[PDB]
Amino acid sequence: ETSEERAARLAKMSAYAAQRLAN
């Protein structure tokens, strides 16, 4: 458990929505 994993969360959640948002 490190801090790097915390960053991937904000990028993972935003990346999942960006791909789902697009038609």
PDB file of N, CA and C in Angstrom:
ATOM      1  N   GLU A   1       0.839  -1.226   0.000  1.00  0.00           N
ATOM      2  CA  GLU A   1       0.000   0.000   0.000  1.00  0.00           C
ATOM      3  C   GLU A   1       0.861   1.259   0.000  1.00  0.00           C
ATOM      4  N   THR A   2       0.845   1.981  -1.114  1.00  0.00           N
ATOM      5  CA  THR A   2       1.625   3.206  -1.244  1.00  0.00           C
ATOM      6  C   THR A   2       0.748   4.364  -1.711  1.00  0.00           C
ATOM      7  N   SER A   3       1.380   5.492  -2.015  1.00  0.00           N
ATOM      8  CA  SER A   3       0.657   6.674  -2.475  1.00  0.00           C
ATOM      9  C   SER A   3       0.389   6.600  -3.975  1.00  0.00           C
ATOM     10  N   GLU A   4       1.267   5.910  -4.697  1.00  0.00           N
ATOM     11  CA  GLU A   4       1.123   5.765  -6.141  1.00  0.00           C
ATOM     12  C   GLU A   4      -0.210   5.114  -6.495  1.00  0.00           C
ATOM     13  N   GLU A   5      -0.661   4.198  -5.645  1.00  0.00           N
ATOM     14  CA  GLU A   5      -1.923   3.503  -5.867  1.00  0.00           C
ATOM     15  C   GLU A   5      -3.107   4.450  -5.705  1.00  0.00           C
ATOM     16  N   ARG A   6      -2.932   5.474  -4.875  1.00  0.00           N
ATOM     17  CA  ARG A   6      -3.988   6.452  -4.633  1.00  0.00           C
ATOM     18  C   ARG A   6      -4.214   7.324  -5.864  1.00  0.00           C
ATOM     19  N   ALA A   7      -3.133   7.635  -6.571  1.00  0.00           N
ATOM     20  CA  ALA A   7      -3.216   8.464  -7.769  1.00  0.00           C
ATOM     21  C   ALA A   7      -3.926   7.729  -8.898  1.00  0.00           C
ATOM     22  N   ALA A   8      -3.613   6.447  -9.054  1.00  0.00           N
ATOM     23  CA  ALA A   8      -4.221   5.630 -10.097  1.00  0.00           C
ATOM     24  C   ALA A   8      -5.740   5.601  -9.960  1.00  0.00           C
ATOM     25  N   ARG A   9      -6.229   5.830  -8.744  1.00  0.00           N
ATOM     26  CA  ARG A   9      -7.664   5.825  -8.484  1.00  0.00           C
ATOM     27  C   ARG A   9      -8.351   6.990  -9.191  1.00  0.00           C
ATOM     28  N   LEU A  10      -7.799   8.189  -9.027  1.00  0.00           N
ATOM     29  CA  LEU A  10      -8.365   9.380  -9.650  1.00  0.00           C
ATOM     30  C   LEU A  10      -8.249   9.308 -11.168  1.00  0.00           C
ATOM     31  N   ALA A  11      -7.201   8.647 -11.644  1.00  0.00           N
ATOM     32  CA  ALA A  11      -6.974   8.506 -13.078  1.00  0.00           C
ATOM     33  C   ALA A  11      -7.754   7.322 -13.639  1.00  0.00           C
ATOM     34  N   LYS A  12      -7.989   6.324 -12.795  1.00  0.00           N
ATOM     35  CA  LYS A  12      -8.724   5.133 -13.202  1.00  0.00           C
ATOM     36  C   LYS A  12     -10.221   5.418 -13.283  1.00  0.00           C
ATOM     37  N   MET A  13     -10.732   6.153 -12.302  1.00  0.00           N
ATOM     38  CA  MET A  13     -12.149   6.496 -12.263  1.00  0.00           C
ATOM     39  C   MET A  13     -12.501   7.482 -13.372  1.00  0.00           C
ATOM     40  N   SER A  14     -11.599   8.423 -13.629  1.00  0.00           N
ATOM     41  CA  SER A  14     -11.816   9.426 -14.666  1.00  0.00           C
ATOM     42  C   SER A  14     -11.637   8.821 -16.055  1.00  0.00           C
ATOM     43  N   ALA A  15     -10.756   7.829 -16.154  1.00  0.00           N
ATOM     44  CA  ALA A  15     -10.493   7.167 -17.426  1.00  0.00           C
ATOM     45  C   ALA A  15     -11.638   6.237 -17.809  1.00  0.00           C
ATOM     46  N   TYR A  16     -12.299   5.676 -16.802  1.00  0.00           N
ATOM     47  CA  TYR A  16     -13.416   4.765 -17.032  1.00  0.00           C
ATOM     48  C   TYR A  16     -14.650   5.526 -17.503  1.00  0.00           C
ATOM     49  N   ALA A  17     -14.829   6.737 -16.981  1.00  0.00           N
ATOM     50  CA  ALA A  17     -15.970   7.566 -17.348  1.00  0.00           C
ATOM     51  C   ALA A  17     -15.780   8.187 -18.727  1.00  0.00           C
ATOM     52  N   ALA A  18     -14.541   8.555 -19.039  1.00  0.00           N
ATOM     53  CA  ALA A  18     -14.225   9.161 -20.327  1.00  0.00           C
ATOM     54  C   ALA A  18     -14.502   8.193 -21.473  1.00  0.00           C
ATOM     55  N   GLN A  19     -14.182   6.922 -21.257  1.00  0.00           N
ATOM     56  CA  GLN A  19     -14.396   5.898 -22.274  1.00  0.00           C
ATOM     57  C   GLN A  19     -15.872   5.521 -22.365  1.00  0.00           C
ATOM     58  N   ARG A  20     -16.570   5.603 -21.235  1.00  0.00           N
ATOM     59  CA  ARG A  20     -17.989   5.269 -21.189  1.00  0.00           C
ATOM     60  C   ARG A  20     -18.838   6.443 -21.666  1.00  0.00           C
ATOM     61  N   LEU A  21     -18.354   7.656 -21.420  1.00  0.00           N
ATOM     62  CA  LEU A  21     -19.069   8.860 -21.826  1.00  0.00           C
ATOM     63  C   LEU A  21     -19.192   8.933 -23.344  1.00  0.00           C
ATOM     64  N   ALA A  22     -18.091   8.654 -24.034  1.00  0.00           N
ATOM     65  CA  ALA A  22     -18.075   8.687 -25.492  1.00  0.00           C
ATOM     66  C   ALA A  22     -19.075   7.696 -26.076  1.00  0.00           C
ATOM     67  N   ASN A  23     -19.774   8.117 -27.125  1.00  0.00           N
ATOM     68  CA  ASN A  23     -20.763   7.266 -27.777  1.00  0.00           C
ATOM     69  C   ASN A  23     -20.086   6.142 -28.554  1.00  0.00           C
TER      70      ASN A  23
END
